[PDB]
Design a protein around this ligand. Structure first.
Ligand SMILES: NC(=O)c1ccc[n+]([C@@H]2O[C@H](COP(=O)([O-])OP(=O)(O)OC[C@H]3O[C@@H](n4cnc5c(N)ncnc54)[C@H](OP(=O)(O)O)[C@@H]3O)[C@@H](O)[C@H]2O)c1
Ligand SMILES: NC(=O)c1ccc[n+]([C@@H]2O[C@H](COP(=O)([O-])OP(=O)(O)OC[C@H]3O[C@@H](n4cnc5c(N)ncnc54)[C@H](OP(=O)(O)O)[C@@H]3O)[C@@H](O)[C@H]2O)c1
Lengths: 224, 238
């Protein structure tokens, strides 16, 4: 039933893309947005990313600033927030950067269809939470994260995970750093891919703030 | 800044600006290509004012088939203001239509005074061209698809100095990838549309990491429930 406070933070091009048509990472935001993202990571209890992001970018999801890591450790918490990968078939690579880098809890959320052999290998390095049939049940995952002490969850994204979280009615706020470039492309990942809403299913927002940061602009939206 | 910013006295083409309304996740319409409420009345008025000051509006054939817009100036006062200064009530209306599929009963042909231009490719069927020439100037450029650089040169040569691209995802890509666009205005509406196959502000092929198009933020203004971002086109990042 219950869930953490959940927000999406992503950086997108002016035409709404998270990455190119080849699924390759480009520089959307500068140092100042990277510092803001690091502050968010430091204050969040957990960070969540989809398997698509892990496979494309192999990110570590760590807090980068030594001062922020020390501030978290001084307050009793691990240097990094809990890192959560949403991954139905348990395909998270065993030598992924989320496993090589930093201290803290890792969680792989898999589906009940996931093969047992891969689940066991991952369980050496992470807590594995099983929900749903062929796909992770994000509502049940969310309540299970809240049960464990997670009150603040940052969805770092993935176009499809963003869709999954938003269409399930789980998100409280959306942060979009809009960068000063056009990426383009029909098949380029956008801020929200997945199936998409029809005319009668559209999700209303309210604009909370708009702040210019370096060469782009940060839009913060409250979900209705 | 390598992009040569054009103005009303530039030689090769009009000043060109894209205007669109999009969702907070970058979509122009749903995955069924259906129009939805993105902009409020104030953004509709801002759009209308832009139309009134432009010499020409350009849309892709896809927009004409999906939405059937007239592309007219709506306000009687804005039309009268154009008229009083010797202009046609409506700016020139241009459709980028490679295969000459613009319907003969399209709303572009029924509503309002002003010139109509159908830009077609050299390969478009001559039967459908001759039918279109009863209602419009037809201009042929490019072998199979409309050559937008050449089209832009021809619009300039006729005396068009200001071109509003009202877009569609594919035409926006065409103009942006050809290096033809000076400014980009996006009203960002207070909604999520979503969808992998939902049209975005710029679809088409897309840029690789070596051909990204750099912008500069000119202004950000809140309007009703959303926000208007205006971007100046700088050159390629490489
Ligand atoms: N610029 C930025 O801010 C930013 C941030 C993050 C990522 N990115 C980019 O985004 C791209 C990746 O996005 P993506 O859409 O491919 O992958 P993604 O959103 O990271 O992950 C999506 C995958 O998660 C799994 N999943 C499991 N249960 C789900 C559920 N209930 N709902 C939705 N998904 C579920 C699905 O695969 P299975 O069913 O097979 O598990 C799904 O395909 C990369 O190119 C990356 O660079 C950009
Ligand atoms: N709210 C807004 O601001 C707004 C405004 C307009 C549209 N929209 C939405 O956009 C959605 C989809 O638009 P769309 O992208 O599918 O249609 P579009 O961009 O209006 O039309 C694209 C078409 O232009 C023609 N074309 C010819 N030569 C070209 C070239 N060199 N480069 C690019 N295009 C060329 C092609 O058709 P041929 O090859 O057959 O000629 C192509 O399919 C619609 O559902 C509509 O609701 C929203």
């Amino acid at each position: 039933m219950d869930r953490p406070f959940i927000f999406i933070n992503s950086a997108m091009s002016a035409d709404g893309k998270l990455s190119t048509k080849e699924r390759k990472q480009v520089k959307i935001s500068g140092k100042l947005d990277f510092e803001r993202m690091d502050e968010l990571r430091a204050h969040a209890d957990a960070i969540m990313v989809g398997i698509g992001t892990v496979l494309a970018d192999d990110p570590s999801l760590t807090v980068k600033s030594p001062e922020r890591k020390a501030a978290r450790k001084a307050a009793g918490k691990s240097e990094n927030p809990v890192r959560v990968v949403v991954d139905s078939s348990a395909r998270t690579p065993l030598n992924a950067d989320i496993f090589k880098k930093g201290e803290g809890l890792r969680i792989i959320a898999v589906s009940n269809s996931a093969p047992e052999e891969k689940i066991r290998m991952l369980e050496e390095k992470a807590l594995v939470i099983k929900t749903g049939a062929f796909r992770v049940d994000l509502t049940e995952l969310a309540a299970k994260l809240k049960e464990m002490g997670i009150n603040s969850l940052m969805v770092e994204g993935g176009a499809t995970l963003n869709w999954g979280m938003l269409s399930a009615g789980l998100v409280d706020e959306v942060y979009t750093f809009v960068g000063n470039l056009i990426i383009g492309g029909k098949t380029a990942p956008t801020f929200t891919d997945g199936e998409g809403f029809t005319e009668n299913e559209l999700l209303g927002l309210e604009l909370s703030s708009a702040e210019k940061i370096e060469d782009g602009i940060l839009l913060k939206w409250k979900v209705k």
